[PDB]
User: Fold this.
Amino acid sequence: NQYYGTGRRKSSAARVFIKPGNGKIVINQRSLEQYFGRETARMVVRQPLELVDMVEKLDLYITVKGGGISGQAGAIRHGITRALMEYDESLRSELRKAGFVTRDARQVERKKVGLRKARRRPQFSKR
Amino acid sequence: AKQSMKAREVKRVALADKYFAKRAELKAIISDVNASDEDRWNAVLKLQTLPRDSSPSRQRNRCRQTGRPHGFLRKFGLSRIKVREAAMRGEIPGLKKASW
Amino acid sequence: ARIAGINIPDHKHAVIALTSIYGVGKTRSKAILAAAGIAEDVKISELSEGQIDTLRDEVAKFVVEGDLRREISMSIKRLMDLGCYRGLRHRRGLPVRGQRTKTNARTRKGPRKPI
Amino acid sequence: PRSLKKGPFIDLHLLKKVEKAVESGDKKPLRTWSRRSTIFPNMIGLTIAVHNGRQHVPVFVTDEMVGHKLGEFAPTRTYRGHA
Amino acid sequence: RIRIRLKAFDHRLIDQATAEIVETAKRTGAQVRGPIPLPTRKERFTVLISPHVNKDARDQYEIRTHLRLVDIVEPTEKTVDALMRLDLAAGVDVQISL
Amino acid sequence: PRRRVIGQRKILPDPKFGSELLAKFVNILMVDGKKSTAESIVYSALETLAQRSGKSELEAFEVALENVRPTVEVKSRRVGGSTYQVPVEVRPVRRNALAMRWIVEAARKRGDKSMALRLANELSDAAENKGTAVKKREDVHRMAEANKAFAH
RNA sequence: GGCCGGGAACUCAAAGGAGACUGCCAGUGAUAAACUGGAGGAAGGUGGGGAUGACGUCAAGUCAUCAUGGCCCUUACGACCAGGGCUACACACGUGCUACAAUGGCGCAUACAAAGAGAAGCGACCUCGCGAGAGCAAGCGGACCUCAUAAAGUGCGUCGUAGUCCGGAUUGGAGUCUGCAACUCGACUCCAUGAAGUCGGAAUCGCUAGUAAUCGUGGAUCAGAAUGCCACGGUGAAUACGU
Ligand SMILES: [Mg+2]
Ligand SMILES: [Mg+2]
Ligand SMILES: [Mg+2]
Ligand SMILES: [Mg+2]
Ligand SMILES: [Mg+2]
Ligand SMILES: [Mg+2]
Ligand SMILES: [Mg+2]
Ligand SMILES: [Mg+2]
Ligand SMILES: [Mg+2]
Ligand SMILES: [Mg+2]
Ligand SMILES: [Mg+2]
Ligand SMILES: [Mg+2]
Ligand SMILES: [Mg+2]
Ligand SMILES: [Mg+2]
Ligand SMILES: [Mg+2]
Ligand SMILES: [Mg+2]
Assistant:
């Protein structure tokens, strides 16, 4: 049966399904290479399944929403790691030791009154 | 502000809503593309006849209590000072200090 | 490469070179070539006398070079002679189109004149 | 500026005064405070004193002045120089 | 079939109102769908707090509007008549459409 | 700082070489947060240099790296209006940082047509001690050599 | 065409709960307070951000938001109207925007957001115009309709270091829209023109992470009039030995 996972990163949310298969990867009804023209995004997506070495032994069905490119790739990481946990529990310490399981909570800070940006101040003169 | 300014605002509102319909019809005549340029000339000459205070653009938003012509907010009808004063006493429903 | 009384470059493409005429911009150049069937990215070097003649005949359809200068001179002289607000601004060498004068206005006044 | 479909702009009282002056010979110069009113070909040969803020400057309309507005010929600022 | 939309500045009051409405509708015999919570609206204001100058000293205020939807299916002629006569609490804006 | 609380932040490896040091180089070369441009530029330059050398990108980069990195620098110390120039050692991580920074800054100041060509030419020159980066390293070494009387 | 029948698993919405407490393990410590490290966990020692400003100082700012003692004017220091000015211009300073280019300019094709507003209002579709726009006219008091294709990015071609296919000031001609009315003194469109500028003296400012830097989007004021102000997301660094 399909094993489920959910990932979130920045402003992006992704949902992942994993089943036995011959290595197919589908994202938003498109191939892996079609969706992400950037190579870093590709290695980002493929890191978890390569650490445990079941690349061609599984089939992945993924959709994403919101954010940009790297945020969507990070959400995909989080979802695939959670689905792999739900498919096998003996791997938990291995992926925790690689930092894949921690959810990245870094957001963007709000603008504040009196400042040009979150932290940049206007130019100050003594006289 | 001065009482004269408040009187002027009241008079401007009266003239505007008294002449609204006639201004609308003359402006509609002028704005039409299928017409006679002689009719357009007559309508232009007639539009100038009305008192200037009948234009809605001649009115300035002001605080309902003090008459301050700067710092208005359309939602409440008051300037910043009076909005803060009333809002701090709980007299504006649903309004409270924000933080996010 | 002798059009309307000037020498135009030969190592440039047609559209870029044709803008050397005082009275011809990018859009007008594109319209001129499109009315004569010459590709935009073809140099003046690789053209036959018939092609240059066709370009000259096309360019003759517009007011260019000395005539345009005469037009502009006559218009500005008319303004200075009327005595209107724009005429006085032309006389004084000050901004004409309502720009700020307390500061800036250097492209029309020039270098600073100290006291 | 003024949209083409709306025509020019002229003041009714000024137009009345201009017509009554033209039909009765070249009379005294005409005082006016209307500076937003464009110049019509009927005005040629007349002398109109336009207000500038403090006084009335006389303008003698010629054939070249048709199209612009009266206020263009009555400066409102006085400046001689600095120092 | 009936749509009902409730608006309020406070969620406790509107929750009590929705509870009493749905219980009244269900005791008649009709069936209900909901309540469904629609997105909350936040309106923000920023004002100067000094009578004169001092630009950087300001306050920020917020108004929240809560909104919920309730659907009535298979309505009885007694259901609607009991629905109007409910006399919901003041401070809750009620819209009923069919 | 007065508190001494910070630690160290994690860096990702480069896309298609599996190396952290190249990722640091790309970060040093990046401007305005446009990482893709910097990584493409460095990849092109490394490919061109590997073609013109034949060894690889990795050890060619390394060989250029030993030829620019420093071994001892100076620090100022005010005493009575003037300053001591005291010589101190450099940690290896700082050695790598200074080498890369000097390399990039020297390469940015050249008259070629593209930044990739500039970087490739400069780094090939530095691989055998001919560029401005090695001159800066020699100057630092000489200045640190002069003032060793205060090296406690 | 989630387009239809359908499902309540999933994203999501909004009400109510759990969760992080030096809680456990080891070592130091004066058996104390506490400090250094480790396990589990989404999060570890104030997890991140905001609100919250003690007694007082500067006879600090505000009689022009308002309120008010005392003084002062009452055919005027009160009132009405038209026109003008607050927009000037030998010069000096503050805060900004746009540049001086190849990590770029231009042309064609194609991905991925968040937050917000709408009835004297937002306005689709279709037709005309190169363009700002014009004509007719659905839907919406809104997770439904409109605003409203996100931009930087990516692939292909060109330009090949020149005051240039960089830069867009000034100026001439022809228009659109709001408004009784664009001369003084509005914004915007088209054609033509093509200034200084090749990284800035003595000096000087901000910033410790989703920060700096860079790229777009919305709102208040408002008939019309943001490079300002207040908010929202994309990409995403260097360095901190030490006092
Ligand atoms: Mg009063
Ligand atoms: Mg107004
Ligand atoms: Mg809304
Ligand atoms: Mg742990
Ligand atoms: Mg720990
Ligand atoms: Mg004082
Ligand atoms: Mg005081
Ligand atoms: Mg004072
Ligand atoms: Mg005073
Ligand atoms: Mg007046
Ligand atoms: Mg002013
Ligand atoms: Mg250009
Ligand atoms: Mg150059
Ligand atoms: Mg142009
Ligand atoms: Mg700090
Ligand atoms: Mg931002």
Notes: Chains B and F do not touch (no CB pair under 8 Å).
